[PDB]
Amino acid sequence: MWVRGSGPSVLSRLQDAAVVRPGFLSTAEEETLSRELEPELRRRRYEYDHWDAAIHGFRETEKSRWSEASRAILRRVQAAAFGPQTLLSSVHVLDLEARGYIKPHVDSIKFCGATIAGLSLLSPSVMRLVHTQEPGEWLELLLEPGSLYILRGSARYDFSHEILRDEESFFGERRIPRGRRISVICRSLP
Ligand SMILES: O=C(O)CNC(=O)C(=O)O
Numbered sequence: 020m021w022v023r024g025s026g027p028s029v030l031s032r033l034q035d036a037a038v039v040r041p042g043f044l045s046t047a048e049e050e051t052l053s054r055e056l057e058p059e060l061r062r063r064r065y066e067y068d069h070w071d072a073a074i075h076g077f078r079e080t081e082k083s084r085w086s087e088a089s090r091a092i093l094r095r096v097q098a099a100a101f102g103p104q105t106l107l108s109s110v111h112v113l114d115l116e117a118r119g120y121i122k123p124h125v126d127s128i129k130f131c132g133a134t135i136a137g138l139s140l141l142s143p144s145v146m147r148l149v150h151t152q153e154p155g156e157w158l159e160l161l162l163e164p165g166s167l168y169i170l171r172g173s174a175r176y177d178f179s180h181e182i183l184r185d186e187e188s189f190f191g192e193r194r195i196p197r198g199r200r201i202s203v204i205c206r207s208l209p
Pocket residue numbers: 073074113121137138180181182202203204
């Protein structure tokens with residue numbers, strides 16, 4: 020329903036490594052972030068395209084000074100995704116344009132620890148993970164507004180991950196029209 024896989028083996032080994040909690044956020048939680056982030060996002064334009072960047076058609080910011088309503092929500096993520104694993108000083112807020120997308124990559128093992136957790140806002144999209152070593156081993160995730168994903172262990176380190184572009188935005192056989200989508204991403208320290 021939300022996770023698809025190249026085979027039964029990838030699905031089993033990555034069962035608590037790459038996970039999807041759709042409807043992690045209520046409507047009211049969704050609007051709290053949406054509303055809080057819009058001014059600081061509108062305050063910048065969709066930054067320049069440099070062919071070899073991972074992210075295209077995006078603007079972004081790092082936020083650490085949050086409302087009490089928004090802090091409550093990140094703590095929920097923190098609670099649900101991280102253990103004893105310290106957080107980064109701040110949260111990465113990524114605003115993709117409908118025409119924007121994210122190419123396959125692994126997050127900097129230098130700066131990002133062993134867990135990545137993203138909240139998804141506004142519009143649906145699919146994140147694809149492919150084994151770096153083995154192209155045949157992949158998982159696609161359906162990320163809906165209000166969803167939380169967690170990428171940890173081997174899905175963080177031996178798999179690349181990407182958010183598909185509108186012309187490729189498929190979950191199995193089903194087109195998932197791409198719109199503007201904000202991500203709120205929480206990362207662990209090395
Ligand atoms: O949460 C997201 O939008 C996906 N995150 C990443 O792939 C990234 O920041 O490079």
